[PDB]
Amino acid sequence: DREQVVALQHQRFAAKKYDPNRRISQKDWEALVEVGRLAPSSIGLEPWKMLLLKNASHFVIYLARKGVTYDSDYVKKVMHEVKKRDYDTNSRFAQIIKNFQENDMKLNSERSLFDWASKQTYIQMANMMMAAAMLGIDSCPIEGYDQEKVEAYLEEKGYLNTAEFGVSVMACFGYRNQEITPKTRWKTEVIYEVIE
Amino acid sequence: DREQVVALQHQRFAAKKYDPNRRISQKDWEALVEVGRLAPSSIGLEPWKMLLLKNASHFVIYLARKGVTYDSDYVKKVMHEVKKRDYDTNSRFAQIIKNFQENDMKLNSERSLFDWASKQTYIQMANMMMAAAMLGIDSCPIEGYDQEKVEAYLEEKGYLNTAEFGVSVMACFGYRNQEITPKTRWKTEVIYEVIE
Numbered sequence: 001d002r003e004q005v006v007a008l009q010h011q012r013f014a015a016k017k018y019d020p021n022r023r024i025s026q027k028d029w030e031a032l033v034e035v036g037r038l039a040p041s042s043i044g045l046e047p048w049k050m051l052l053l054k055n056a057s058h059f060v061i062y063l064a065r066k067g068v069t070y071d072s073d074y075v076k077k078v079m080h081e082v083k084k085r086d087y088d089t090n091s092r093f094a095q096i097i098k099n100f101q102e103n104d105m106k107l108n109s110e111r112s113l114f115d116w117a118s119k120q121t122y123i124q125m126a127n128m129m130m131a132a133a134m135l136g137i138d139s140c141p142i143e144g145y146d147q148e149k150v151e152a153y154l155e156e157k158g159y160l161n162t163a164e165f166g167v168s169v170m171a172c173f174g175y176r177n178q179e180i181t182p183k184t185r186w187k188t189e190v191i192y193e194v195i196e
Numbered sequence: 197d198r199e200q201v202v203a204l205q206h207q208r209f210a211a212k213k214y215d216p217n218r219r220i221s222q223k224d225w226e227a228l229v230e231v232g233r234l235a236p237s238s239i240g241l242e243p244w245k246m247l248l249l250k251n252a253s254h255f256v257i258y259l260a261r262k263g264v265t266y267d268s269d270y271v272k273k274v275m276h277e278v279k280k281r282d283y284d285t286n287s288r289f290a291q292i293i294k295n296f297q298e299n300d301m302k303l304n305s306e307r308s309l310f311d312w313a314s315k316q317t318y319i320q321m322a323n324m325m326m327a328a329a330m331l332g333i334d335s336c337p338i339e340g341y342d343q344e345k346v347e348a349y350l351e352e353k354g355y356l357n358t359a360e361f362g363v364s365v366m367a368c369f370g371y372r373n374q375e376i377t378p379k380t381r382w383k384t385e386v387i388y389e390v391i392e
């Protein structure tokens with residue numbers, strides 16, 4: 001019920017202290033990765049790839065694809081292989097994607113295109129954290145790293161092709177070893193308004 | 197259990213056809229807005245505001261704040277009013293925010309700053325769609341609008357101060373009047389990899 005739904009939003013908090021002797025089970029972790037696999041994305045393009053840093057219980061680096069444009073190899077690939085659509089750059093549909101990105105959304109630079117794909121990964125990460133809370137597992141979203149040094153690092157180890165992907169965001173997962181931090185938020189009237 | 201958690205991810209789909217005679221109850225809607233209020237954000241800044249377009253059952257326009265920088269009026273405001281932190285631009289902490297944004301995240305333009313705040317709103321919208329699915333309510337995330345015309349429109353009606361906010365994304369909520377669309381996604385090995 002709605003009481004339970006709201007309660008879960010308090011259970012989900014940014015856990016900073018983790019129980020080093022309790023790990024997420026193999027099966028629970030596979031379910032959370034599945035949650036990430038099944039996340040929605042704009043135009044269904046899934047412009048992402050997740051890395052588990054095995055080398056908290058589990059640490060995920062979310063990658064977002066670069067240059068995901070109507071005429072890109074990746075878009076043609078996902079449309080054929082996943083969507084089973086006979087996609088080509090001169091179709092009405094390709095042209096709808098082109099207008100949507102270039103004009104509707106002003107995705108006119110490499111950075112704006114990358115940040116657009118990165119937004120989709122925030123859905124993917126959010127869904128995982130919320131599913132983790134449903135399983136009684138804690139998480140913390142993580143932006144606090146130097147993106148240039150991290151990407152140099154990953155590229156050096158051979159786990160990032162910087163032409164194709166950039167690092168988007170990270171999250172860790174495990175079991176908390178601290179109390180649930182009470183929420184502090186703006187009051188409803190400040191962050192929500194009805195138009196007429 | 198994990199079976200139920202994964203099942204929910206199939207229940208949540210992009211509903212395009214809605215039952216025009218069934219509306220979300222007042223209490224269920226207030227719970228979903230609460231889900232949006234309680235969403236996490238980078239540095240806890242909540243750089244957002246939601247609008248219900250009342251003038252699917254419920255249509256939400258997610259706004260993200262512009263120019264949310266270490267020295268901005270908004271950051272000083274949220275730190276004091278919500279976090280009850282005696283924040284000032286010359287503190288170690290203000291300087292950590294400055295370095296994080298400018299250097300770690302390369303937020304060096306109005307657009308990059310705006311898209312960073314917009315990413316946080318995708319978490320907010322994701323959490324609402326997932327909570328909606330927990331309540332048996334359907335949703336569709338929506339990027340398919342012309343951002344310039346929409347923002348001109350909202351500004352004209354007096355519901356958008358374009359100096360302070362931009363439109364980030366939209367979503368609609370209600371009850372489906374069609375079958376659940378089966379998921380099509382990349383296979384696990386394509387979108388997920390373990391480092392060592």
Ligand SMILES: Cc1cc2nc3c(=O)[nH]c(=O)nc-3n(C[C@H](O)[C@H](O)[C@H](O)COP(=O)(O)O)c2cc1C
Pocket residue numbers: 012013014015016140141142143144145169181183234235236237238239240319
């Ligand atoms: C995208 C994003 C990035 C975050 N990055 C960090 C981080 O790098 N380090 C950290 O300690 N907390 C990080 N957080 C946690 C936020 O401080 C926290 O979510 C926010 O204060 C709201 O608190 P709550 O998550 O407990 O509800 C991040 C949160 C978000 C959503």
Ligand SMILES: Cc1cc2nc3c(=O)[nH]c(=O)nc-3n(C[C@H](O)[C@H](O)[C@H](O)COP(=O)(O)O)c2cc1C
Pocket residue numbers: 038039040041042043044123208209210211212336337338339340341365377379
């Ligand atoms: C951020 C984003 C924006 C979307 N915008 C639209 C849209 O404007 N119009 C539409 O029909 N569907 C839109 N969708 C729905 C996607 O096509 C859909 O999520 C994707 O194909 C995956 O299918 P599923 O959501 O049913 O799992 C959007 C989805 C995302 C996440």
